[PDB]
Amino acid sequence: AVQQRRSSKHRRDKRRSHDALTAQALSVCQKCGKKKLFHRVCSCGMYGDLRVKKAY
Amino acid sequence: NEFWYHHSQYIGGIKKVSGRDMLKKQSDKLVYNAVKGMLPDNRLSRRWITKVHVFKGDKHNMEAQKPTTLNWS
Amino acid sequence: SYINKPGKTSAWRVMTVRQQVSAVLAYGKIETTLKKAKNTQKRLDKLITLAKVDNFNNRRQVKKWLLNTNLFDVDQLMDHLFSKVAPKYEKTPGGYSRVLKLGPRRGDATEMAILQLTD
Amino acid sequence: MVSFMTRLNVADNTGAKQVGIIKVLGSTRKRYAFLGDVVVVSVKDAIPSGMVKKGQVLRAVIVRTKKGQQRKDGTHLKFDDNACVLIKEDKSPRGTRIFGPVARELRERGYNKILSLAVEVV
């Protein structure tokens, strides 16, 4: 439908208080120092030191 | 004469309880609602009513709080 | 609504899966979507464990599952798989390919993955 | 499964071709013509050489179900057609000699005459 009365600006801010994403993971890479994500590849090209990607 | 009649937002189970039936299941909400019947709808209404700790026995859980032993308060 | 972009239809999905498995057989590794990468790994493992016989029967059967690409066509991918890809990894019970998770996409932040062939 | 006005077959010497369900009698609002229950049907096509003609409302006992139901016995209760016997307003059909398999679930309400009027019981 459509709204009768406008949702407030502060009501909008309070409603949008839970649109943000959830927390993420952190992982230490032993060979190439970086705080990457869990079961992801770092910018150094390695998932947990398996050289599986290029430099970029 | 005085039964106890209640109807929340739920429908189809309108609660009508006799005096002897109240003694079988629950008795604290009796005095709870009786006292809250003298409380205006405000911020501390349901906060004022919790100060009326309704018990069916002579003891209470707040004996460690130094209760004033008296009668008819 | 009515007629518009078809999208990911079942026929299109299976054709894309065939194209991706042919691409991972030709180029070796493929950077694609994680859900597509895992299906491609599954099909590649099935093809590797099917091609250990190296007979015309598997040629005809896999003929319905490979789609030609830039480098390799269907019957050249046949010989490629039957010669080097399948026998190289048959020494182990499974694990003919590995999928690893990558970062998101620039414009659409799509979680991607990389699929490689290994023992 | 047979439902309201789901035309079903007649397999006895009655003089009618097709019968359509009008209601189900027995318990309250059965709404499904299963084996073991007598139903009321209407005839929209009937030869004038029998004792029943077009336009009348008769009764039938369904004895064969094409899709059928999962019978408690162990084998899926299944026939080759949704077949019934157009009865003469009782447990017995209008035919003097009954041909074809007869439902074994009819015993919950009777209908023993359909079985006893035939040499075999399937």
Place this chain on the structure above:
Amino acid sequence: KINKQALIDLVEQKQLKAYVPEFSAGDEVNVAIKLKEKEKVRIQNFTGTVLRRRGKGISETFIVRKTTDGIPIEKNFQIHNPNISIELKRRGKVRRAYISYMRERSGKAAKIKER
């Protein structure tokens, strides 16, 4: 945590029959029904062509197509049904587990068998 998904057949093995085949449906089988009649206890056979071959244990069903008194009957008979004896009679030349070209034949004829 731990899963087995093998007890599905185990519940059925306590009284599983030893026949329990897995073949190409389309054969001709006769199944007998022991009618414990008051007089002349009867063994009423129920013969017909197989149509579908399904079953995950004691639920190994198969459809038998008979015709009695001009009325046909396709019964989804269970192999392990008590008071039911099941035997396999004819193994015809069949390339499927669901055929219908055997159902469009006429009388006074015969079918070829597998070579």
Place this chain on the structure above:
Amino acid sequence: MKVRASVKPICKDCKIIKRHQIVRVICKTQKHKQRQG
């Protein structure tokens, strides 16, 4: 049993009572037993 707004002797012996705040006439014969008097 019944419903009325006044109860009077109906039969030869139809006594008038006040049962559950309801004035009634009840006879030794079960016929003449009304309510709501």
Place this chain on the structure above:
Amino acid sequence: MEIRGIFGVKVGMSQVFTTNNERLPITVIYCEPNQVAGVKTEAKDKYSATLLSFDTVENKKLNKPQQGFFEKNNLKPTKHLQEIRNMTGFEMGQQITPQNLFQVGEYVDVSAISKGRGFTGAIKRWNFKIGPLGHGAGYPHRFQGSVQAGRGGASAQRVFKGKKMSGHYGHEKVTVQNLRIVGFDEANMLVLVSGAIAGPEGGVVLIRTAKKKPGVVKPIELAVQTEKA
């Protein structure tokens, strides 16, 4: 009281032949021997219930607080713990079996968790009915209809609470009353339950002594075949 409870994991649905040469719909549930973590009285923790611990597994992913709970109640590490409501039996540290809790074919009540379907509307939850849609059906084609209760303040000016609107279907515990027990198998610690009981291929099942037909028993046990190859 009369409430005797057993737990298990449903490995799916099957079939088997019961007495009188009749087949019954069979849900197959594996049962692990239980051990009671507590008997809570109406004056102990204010509730009458029996907390049983089952599914003995490795302690790598368990709670050390739960481990000590087991120890001070003389138990072993278990994956699952559950309180049956309205009971005072099952003395602490007892390995219970369904043989002493039920009969082979007695009437019981079985609770089970439905297969997860996510947020499925009330039409598939409460099994509404739809009439004929011939000669036009409007812009939509599926809806549960009206919840009208007053417009303005005349009768309700609201929607009656408990209205059957779109929600969650599946993964909701359901109790079927007075169903007979098909078969036990203490060699493999397995149970067969009659009817079409809830549970995915991996769901859980609780069996309790019936409260309307506790002692009523009729045979649906395993039926020997009169013709075995």
Place this chain on the structure above:
RNA sequence: ACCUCGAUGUCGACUCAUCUCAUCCUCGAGCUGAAGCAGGUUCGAAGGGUUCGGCUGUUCGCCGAUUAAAGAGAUACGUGAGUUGGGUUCAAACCGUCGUGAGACAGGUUGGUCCCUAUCUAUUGUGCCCGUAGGAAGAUUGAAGAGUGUUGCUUCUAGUACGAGAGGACCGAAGCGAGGACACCUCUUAUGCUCCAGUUGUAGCGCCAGCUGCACCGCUGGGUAGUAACGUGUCUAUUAGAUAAACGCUGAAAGCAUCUAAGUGUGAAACUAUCUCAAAGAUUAAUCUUCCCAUUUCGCAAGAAAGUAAGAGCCGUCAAAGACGAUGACGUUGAUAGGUUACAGGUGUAAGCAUAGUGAUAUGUUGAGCUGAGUAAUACUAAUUGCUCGAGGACU
């Protein structure tokens, strides 16, 4: 002619049904000019249920066909931000009539007439945060309660009671169980478009066998786990308390009778329940237990700094969850999941190798070929070397 025309969307239907019970039934008895087998009235009773269609368009109104029951009404003569315009009647036209006419009939008919991205609230589930009253950790007495809370059929009983006599059973027991709610995919099926097996070709893999992109899954058949009914399985009933209508016993008033007035009772699906339950955001923020520490030291105590030494979470193979998050099994330590063996289950004796059939096709290769969802073993792979939340018992 009023709150309402600087509008207050209505007829009817489908669905959702709820409610008061001046009751249809069930449940219960009285009264009975009730002969019995069954019951006429009455109330208690909202607790549940309380027909399908052809036809005026439609439930309803005619007719046919149903059970113990197919309710007395409101919810804007319920419904329309859930649906429809069905006909009067739209924009057009006809038919009989009228008006010389625009046109009209408290006349009939066809063409043909309804928007909603839900802000809150009402409401169904899942959430983040915090409190969750030491962290974590399991479970609930409970606060506002709702749903099944409906119930028949068959047989014996028994030709005995009741009538008198034909008549003639409820009563007692048993099974089947119909709406409603509940769920399952086990049998069956529909599907299963990552399975197999046939199929007409375009067009091809240079060609042909085999198939290929495609042709409504290209066609349709069976079909993995399946999902759902096209199917299965349940239950209501009964009951405890107190009552109602009802029947009362002593028994007064009224020295006697006599349900209430003091005593002594039953009684219904009606109230709580009894069949099913669980919720402390119940801020009424709760109780118990457990692992941990409480290591001398610092908010209108977060027991400060060593804020774990205990636990959980992040994330992945995934679903057991699930709108999405969350939640949960397993995490190189492993069967938690993917792939391999066997394959479960299913398709259904692949193909050529040579022959038979002249040929479609088949045969030693064959229950092999295969299984996408799935199964027991299988590190072969994935789940990380990993990181985060995370205690000194708050306040009494």
Place this chain on the structure above:
RNA sequence: AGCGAAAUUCCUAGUCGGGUAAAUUCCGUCCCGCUUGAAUGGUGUAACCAUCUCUUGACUGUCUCGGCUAUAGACUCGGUG
């Protein structure tokens, strides 16, 4: 003359048969004619209406009774919004 409740007629849900299991809507016919009725035509129209009133069959999910498979999606993530 002819006509009929006929797109039509308060009485009228006309009536008879048929259609329809079921018929006020429909056909033929008798016709309670505010009101038929003769080129505002009475009136059958074989053929047919991109209109209609009703019945029905091969045939189908329109339905008794809906269900699964794939999706553009919606739910989620990202860009604009």
